[PDB]
Design a protein around this ligand. Structure first.
Ligand SMILES: [Zn+2]
Ligand SMILES: [Zn+2]
Length: 72
């Protein structure tokens, strides 16, 4: 399973994930890719604000979904 995270400049990060990954796990992967601290990261999927402790499955994030990094 992979997801796409678009940064604030529109750069695409491609991540390998699992349905049970938390948003906090995803923020750690974005930090390794781009050097963005997790506390600087805010993510949305389909208009929903994603919380660190909830999982991809909890938000119905699927293969090939796109998330966005948005302003903190
Ligand atoms: Zn696993
Ligand atoms: Zn994982």
């Amino acid at each position: 399973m992979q997801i796409f995270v678009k940064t604030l400049t529109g750069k695409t990060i491609t991540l390998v994930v699992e349905p049970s990954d938390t948003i906090e796990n995803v923020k750690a992967k974005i930090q390794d890719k781009e050097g963005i601290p997790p506390d600087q990261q805010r993510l949305i999927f389909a208009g929903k604000q994603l919380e660190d402790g909830r999982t991809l499955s909890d938000y119905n994030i699927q293969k090939e979904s796109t998330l966005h990094l948005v302003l903190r």
